[PDB]
Design an enzyme around this catalytic site. Structure first.
Site, PDB file in Angstrom:
ATOM      1  N   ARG B  54      14.018  62.197  43.593  1.00 24.05           N
ATOM      2  CA  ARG B  54      12.753  61.610  43.139  1.00 24.05           C
ATOM      3  C   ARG B  54      12.173  60.901  44.355  1.00 24.05           C
ATOM      4  NH1 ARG B  54      11.607  56.293  40.697  1.00 24.05           N
ATOM      5  NH2 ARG B  54       9.688  56.396  39.406  1.00 24.05           N
ATOM      6  N   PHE B  59       5.827  54.765  48.223  1.00 25.88           N
ATOM      7  CA  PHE B  59       6.679  53.931  47.393  1.00 25.88           C
ATOM      8  C   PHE B  59       8.144  53.984  47.882  1.00 25.88           C
ATOM      9  CE2 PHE B  59       8.673  51.667  44.225  1.00 25.88           C
ATOM     10  CZ  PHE B  59       9.027  52.324  43.057  1.00 25.88           C
ATOM     11  N   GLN B  62      14.358  58.165  46.185  1.00 21.82           N
ATOM     12  CA  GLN B  62      15.475  57.852  45.294  1.00 21.82           C
ATOM     13  C   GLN B  62      16.534  58.942  45.320  1.00 21.82           C
ATOM     14  OE1 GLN B  62      14.369  56.940  41.264  1.00 21.82           O
ATOM     15  NE2 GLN B  62      16.481  56.755  40.516  1.00 21.82           N
ATOM     16  N   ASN B 101      18.562  51.192  38.820  1.00 19.85           N
ATOM     17  CA  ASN B 101      19.383  50.845  37.661  1.00 19.85           C
ATOM     18  C   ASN B 101      18.691  51.254  36.366  1.00 19.85           C
ATOM     19  OD1 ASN B 101      17.705  48.669  36.726  1.00 19.85           O
ATOM     20  ND2 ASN B 101      18.521  47.419  38.468  1.00 19.85           N
ATOM     21  N   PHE B 112      17.593  53.524  46.273  1.00 16.41           N
ATOM     22  CA  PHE B 112      16.347  53.975  46.873  1.00 16.41           C
ATOM     23  C   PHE B 112      16.171  53.373  48.247  1.00 16.41           C
ATOM     24  CE2 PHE B 112      13.549  50.226  45.694  1.00 16.41           C
ATOM     25  CZ  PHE B 112      14.372  49.594  44.708  1.00 16.41           C
ATOM     26  N   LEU B 121       9.736  44.512  42.486  1.00 12.71           N
ATOM     27  CA  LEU B 121      11.124  44.813  42.105  1.00 12.71           C
ATOM     28  C   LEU B 121      12.112  43.661  42.409  1.00 12.71           C
ATOM     29  CD1 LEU B 121      11.271  48.528  43.334  1.00 12.71           C
ATOM     30  CD2 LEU B 121      10.686  47.616  41.021  1.00 12.71           C
ATOM     31  N   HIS B 125      16.233  44.513  41.136  1.00 11.53           N
ATOM     32  CA  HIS B 125      16.990  45.532  41.889  1.00 11.53           C
ATOM     33  C   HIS B 125      17.638  44.828  43.061  1.00 11.53           C
ATOM     34  CE1 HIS B 125      14.420  47.957  39.381  1.00 11.53           C
ATOM     35  NE2 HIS B 125      15.382  48.851  39.531  1.00 11.53           N
TER      36      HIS B 125
END
Lengths: 11, 163
Positions: B54, B59, B62, B101, B112, B121, B125
Site C-alpha cells: 500500500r 503520504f 506501507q 496497527n 510504514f 498520527l 502510531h
C-alpha cells in the site's frame, strides 16, 4: 482520510 | 541491539539499491528489536521476500505483511501482537519508520515509511527509526503508488538484515 491501519482501511 | 538495518529493494524485479535505517533503540527498544529481528530473519521468518502492499504518494509506503501481503497479516517476534511501547517520537519529517496497527496495542510486523510529516498520527502510531540512506529509493517506490494505495509494479524486499 490519511490512516496507516492493518486490515479495516478508513477514509 | 544497535546495528542499523538495510532493505534491498526491487521494482518489477529491477534492483534499485539499498535503504538503510537507524532505529531509535534508546526511545523504543522493544519496537526496534522487533523490526531489526524481522529484518535479520533470525526467528525463521520476517521481511525478506515481502512486498510493500500500500503506497500512497505524498503520504507513506506501507509494508511488512509477510504472511498475507495485503494488510490483513503479519506477526511480531513477541507473538501476533504487542503493546504500543510509547509515543514519544513524533512524525515530524519524511523518512520516518512507524508502526501500522489496527487500534491500540495491535502492533505486529506491518510498518510504514513516511514521505511527508504525518503529525495527525502522533500518539496513535509508534515511531521507531529513520531512513539514513536511500530516501531516493523511497521516493522512486512512492511514484509507483496511487491514492488508493494500489501499486503499478511489484515492490519487493529482496534481502534485508543488519549492516
Amino acid at each position: 482520510x490519511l490512516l496507516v491501519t492493518a486490515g479495516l482501511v478508513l477514509a | 541491539a544497535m546495528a542499523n538495518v538495510f532493505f534491498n529493494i526491487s521494482i518489477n524485479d529491477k534492483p534499485e539499491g539499498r535503504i538503510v535505517f537507524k532505529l531509535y533503540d534508546e526511545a523504543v527498544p522493544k519496537t526496534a528489536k522487533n523490526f531489526r529481528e524481522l529484518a535479520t530473519g533470525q526467528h525463521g521468518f520476517g521481511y525478506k521476500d515481502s512486498i510493500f502492499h500500500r503506497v500512497i504518494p505524498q503520504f507513506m509506503l506501507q509494508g511488512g505483511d509477510f504472511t498475507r501481503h495485503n494488510g490483513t497479516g503479519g506477526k511480531s517476534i513477541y507473538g501476533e501482537k504487542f503493546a504500543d511501547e510509547n509515543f514519544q517520537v513524533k512524525h515530524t519529517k519524511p523518512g520516518l519508520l512507524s508502526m501500522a496497527n489496527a487500534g491500540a496495542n495491535t502492533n505486529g510486523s506491518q510498518f510504514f515509511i513516511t514521505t511527508v510529516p504525518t503529525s495527525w498520527l502522533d500518539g496513535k502510531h509508534v515511531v521507531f527509526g529513520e531512513v539514513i540512506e536511500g530516501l531516493d529509493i523511497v521516493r522512486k517506490v512512492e511514484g509507483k503508488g496511487s491514492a488508493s494505495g494500489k501499486t503499478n509494479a511489484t515492490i519487493k524486499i529482496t534481502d534485508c538484515g543488519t549492516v
